[PDB]
Amino acid sequence: PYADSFKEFTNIDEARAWGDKQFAKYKLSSSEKNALTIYTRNAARINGPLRANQGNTNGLPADIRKEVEQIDKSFTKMQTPENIILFRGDDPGYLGPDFENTILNRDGTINKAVFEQVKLRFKGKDRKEYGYISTSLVNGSAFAGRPIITKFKVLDGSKAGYIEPISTFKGQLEVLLPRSSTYTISDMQIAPNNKQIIITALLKR
Numbered sequence: 001p002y003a004d005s006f007k008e009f010t011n012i013d014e015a016r017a018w019g020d021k022q023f024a025k026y027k028l029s030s031s032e033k034n035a036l037t038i039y040t041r042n043a044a045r046i047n048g049p050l051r052a053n054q055g056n057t058n059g060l061p062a063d064i065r066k067e068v069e070q071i072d073k074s075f076t077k078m079q080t081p082e083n084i085i086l087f088r089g090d091d092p093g094y095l096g097p098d099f100e101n102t103i104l105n106r107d108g109t110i111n112k113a114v115f116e117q118v119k120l121r122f123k124g125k126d127r128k129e130y131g132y133i134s135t136s137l138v139n140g141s142a143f144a145g146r147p148i149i150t151k152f153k154v155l156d157g158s159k160a161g162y163i164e165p166i167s168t169f170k171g172q173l174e175v176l177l178p179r180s181s182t183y184t185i186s187d188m189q190i191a192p193n194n195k196q197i198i199i200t201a202l203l204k205r
Contacts, residue, residue, distance in 0.1 A: 001083075002186070002202045006153050008085040015137040015173050019162035026077045026161065033166050035070030039132065040167040040174070046071075047131025047179075055130045055180045068179070071132065075178050078161030084154050086135035086175050089146030095122075104147060109194045118197070122185045126204075133177035137162070142172050149191075150199040152183060158205045177203070 009015035028036070039046055046064055053059035057068060092100045095118055102114045135152060136142060143149060154160055154177075164174040187200040 001155055001205075002153050004083055004155075006083040006085045009137045009173075010139075012138055012140070012171075012173070016164070019137055019164055019173060019175070022081070022162045023165045026074075028074055028077060028166075029070075032070050032074035032077075035067045036074060036161075036163050036176070037166050037168060038067055039071060039176075040163070040169060043132070043134060050131045050179055053130075071176075072179070074161065075159040078159060078176075080154055080156060080158055080160040082156050084137075084160075086137065086152045086154055086160070086177070087139040087143065088133065088135040088150045088152070089143035090148040090150065092147060094148055103197075108147075110147070110190045110197060112190070115188075115190055115197065119188050123188050124185065126182055126184050127201075128180065128182045130180055132179045133181055135175045135177060137173040137175055140171075140173065147195065148197045148199065150201050152177070152201045152203045154203045155205045158203060 009018070046067060049060050049064050050068065057065050060068060092103050095103060098121075099114065099118055103111055103118060105111050133152075135150075139149065139151075159178045161176050162174070163176050164172060167174050182204040183201040184204070185199055186202050187198075189198050190196070191198055
C-alpha cells in the first residue's frame with residue numbers, strides 16, 4: 001500500500017483550505033478541542049510523561065492523563081480521507097544519545113561517517129513513538145534549520161487530525177498523529193545541501 005500514490009502538498013493555501021475543511025468535519029467536542037489546545041501550548045508536558053511511561057496511562061499525573069484521554073478520544077473522529085505525506089522536523093536528540101552530539105559537524109554539516117552508523121541502526125527497522133507526533137502538511141519555514149526532516153507516508157483511513165485551527169500557534173499547517181504510533185523507516189538520506197537528514201517513514205495503519 002506504500003507503493004500507491006500519496007498527496008504531497010506544496011501550496012500553503014491549498015493545504016490550509018483542505019485542512020480547514022477537514023477540521024470542520026471532525027465535530028470535536030469542547031473538551032477535545034481544549035485538550036488539543038493544551039497539547040499545542042506545550043507538547044513536551046504531555047509527550048515527556050508519555051515517553052517515560054511507555055504509554056502506560058496509570059503512570060501519568062492525573063491532569064496529564066485526562067488530557068491524553070481527551071486527545072485519544074479526539075482521534076476517534078480524526079482520520080485522513082486519502083493517502084497523504086506529512087512532514088516533521090526534528091533535532092539530533094531524535095536519533096538518541098549515541099548520536100545526539102556526534103551527527104553534526106561543528107559547521108552544521110552532517111557527519112557522514114556518523115550518518116552511516118545512524119542508517120545501520122535505523123534503516124529498515126520499525127520505530128514506536130510513545131508521545132503524540134506533531135507534523136505539518138507542508139515542508140515549510142517552520143522547519144528552517146532543523147537538521148532532520150521526516151516525510152511520513154500515511155494511508156487513507158489512518159488516525160490523523162488537522163488541528164491547526166485550535167493551535168496556540170499560527171501558520172504551521174499542523175497535523176497530529178496518535179500516540180504509540182509505529183512506523184518503518186524505509187529510507188534515510190543526506191539532503192543535497194549537506195545539512196539535513198531526510199527520513200522516509202511508513203506509518204503503520
